[PDB]
């Protein structure tokens, strides 16, 4: 018994004196391509592993950097708004401002 790899391009084999025989492979894979995102991811991975892994990690990295940058920008905006009150001797922050933005 032997095992022969059949890619999507096809395989031709010759055995003895019969005519050579050709075989082709369809695009079958596990998972379902129209459900929750994990099912789609696993279907695509079954069809093409390396490209799908690369795409997923790139998407995750981009989402993470975007969200972290925007959160840091909002924090910096809060700090810039609230700093001039702390440098002022005495005085106080309006309660509306201290409720809208967390002011210790």
């Amino acid at each position: 018994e032997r095992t022969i790899p059949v890619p999507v391009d096809g395989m031709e084999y010759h055995w003895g004196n019969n005519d050579p025989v050709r075989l082709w492979s369809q695009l079958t894979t596990e998972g379902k391509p129209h459900g929750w995102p994990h099912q789609i991811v696993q279907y695509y991975y079954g069809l093409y592993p390396a490209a799908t892994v690369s795409a997923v990690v790139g998407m995750s990295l981009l989402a993470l950097i975007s969200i972290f940058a925007s959160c840091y920008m909002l924090v910096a905006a809060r700090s810039k708004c609230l700093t001039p009150y702390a440098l002022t001797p005495g005085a106080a922050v309006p309660w509306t401002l201290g409720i809208l933005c967390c002011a210790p």
């Binding site: 082709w24 369809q26 905006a77």
Partner: protein, 438 residues
């Protein structure tokens, strides 16, 4: 009317080419490739066959001496041996006890079956292409043999077709090849006049009928045994048989792109690579004016079943309103999906059904019937089988439409994050502006 298109060079794949000019209904031409042939230009270098050794009877001189003169023969070896006492069945051949001399010589010549069993050494060059093409349109069905080189111009039903040139300069043959019976090998060979004993090309000849021969097989002669009459010689075995024993792997079982090698003449068939440009000049008799063509209004498209596979596993229906029964040309404007029929019978019923094949999870493509167009978006489930015997009947494409489910999810996530970022940047802008106004 002049037109140009590009068709893939894969055998058995139907091609629909769309033609549309003002003042006439659109038309679709079915073009297919039945077989392709790729032949190189060969110039012979030498041929090789098995050898045979010609050794005549020795010349024994009793009570005397002899000397031999050089001849002009392939690998002529001669020697004179002194002090011999030959014997026979009756008795001593010579009366003199130790004054005899034996002259021996031998040479080599091509075998008596060299015309029927030999291997040829060829040098390959630029290769030309021939093809057989089936053309269908209207009431025209014909197969023609063409040269794909941009020169041949064929006429099918008064329509001029020019093919080629091929878009890839690829050949499987190396510069030097060797041909034997029904096999070609990409093996380099020794140059003429410089063969080596024991290996390929130990005897060389410019052609089968040539009267010259170059032989180098290390013929050596030996002194005859005492009390004996014979001629002993040592010589390396024939290099042709040695080559035949372990020639290697033939190019027939190693040629890429799954294309078949045949000999007499040397050629490679069905070599699937590249694409062929087609230039066409059509007469006005094959078109139909708008006046005698049906008018289609308010036509929309929907899909019934879609399972993307190498077969035609897809059915889509088209609804329309017309004014008279007739025939129309139907076509798909994208290569994501490929249709099967080219002409559709339109009737007053208002519904037609067509088959198609695709290879993406969610294909979106625009179809056209007569002068009207519509869009078709679908979702197709993968097949359950693993191996099929036939080849793919679709162009390979996998990228889904931007309105597909996965694309929809990524678009939603991106839009949410973009709105979040826009809000953050707007807040920063207003904060810094009010701060600077202070």
């Amino acid at each position: 009317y002049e037109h140009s298109t590009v068709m893939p060079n894969v055998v058995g794949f139907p091609y629909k080419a769309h033609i549309e000019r003002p003042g006439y209904s659109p038309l679709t031409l079915q073009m297919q490739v039945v077989e392709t042939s790729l032949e190189p230009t060969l110039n012979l270098e030498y041929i090789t066959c098995e050898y045979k050794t010609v050794v005549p009877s020795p010349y024994v001189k009793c009570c005397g001496a002899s000397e031999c003169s050089t001849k002009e023969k392939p690998d002529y070896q001669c020697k004179v041996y002194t002090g011999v006492y030959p014997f026979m069945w009756g008795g001593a051949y010579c009366f003199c006890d130790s004054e005899n001399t034996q002259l021996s010589e031998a040479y080599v010549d091509r075998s008596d079956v060299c015309r029927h069993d030999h291997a040829s050494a060829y040098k390959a060059h630029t290769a030309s292409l021939k093809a057989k093409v089936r053309v269908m349109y209207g009431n025209v069905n014909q197969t023609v043999d063409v040269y794909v080189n941009g020169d041949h111009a064929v006429t099918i039903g008064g329509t001029q077709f020019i093919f080629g040139p091929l878009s890839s300069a690829w050949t499987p043959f190396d510069n030097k090849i060797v041909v034997y019976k029904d096999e070609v090998f990409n093996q380099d060979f020794p140059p003429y006049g410089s063969g080596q004993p024991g290996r390929f090309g130990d005897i060389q000849s410019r052609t089968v009928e040539s009267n010259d021969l170059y032989a180098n097989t290390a013929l050596k002669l030996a002194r005859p045994s005492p009390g004996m009459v014979h001629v002993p010689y040592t010589q390396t075995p024939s290099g042709f048989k040695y080559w035949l024993k372990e020639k290697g792997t033939a190019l027939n079982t190693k040629a890429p792109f799954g294309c078949q090698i045949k000999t007499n003449p040397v050629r490679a068939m069905n070599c699937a690579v590249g694409n062929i440009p087609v230039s066409m000049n059509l007469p006005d008799s094959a078109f139909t004016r708008i006046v005698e063509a049906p008018t289609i209004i308010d036509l929309t498209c929907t899909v019934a079943t879609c399972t993307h596979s190498s077969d035609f596993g897809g059915v889509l229906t088209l609804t329309y309103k017309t004014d008279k029964n007739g025939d129309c040309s139907v076509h798909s404007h994208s290569n994501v999906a490929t249709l099967q029929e080219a002409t559709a019978k339109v009737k007053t019923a208002g519904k037609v059904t067509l088959h198609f094949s695709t290879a993406s999870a969610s294909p979106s493509f625009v179809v056209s019937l007569c002068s009207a167009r519509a869009t078709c978006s679908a979702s197709c489930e993968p097949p359950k089988d693993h191996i099929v015997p036939y080849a793919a009947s679709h162009s390979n494409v996998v990228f889904p439409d931007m309105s597909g489910t996965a694309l929809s999810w990524v678009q939603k996530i991106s839009g949410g994050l973009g709105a979040f970022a826009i809000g953050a940047i707007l807040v920063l802008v207003v904060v810094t502006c009010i701060g600077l106004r202070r």
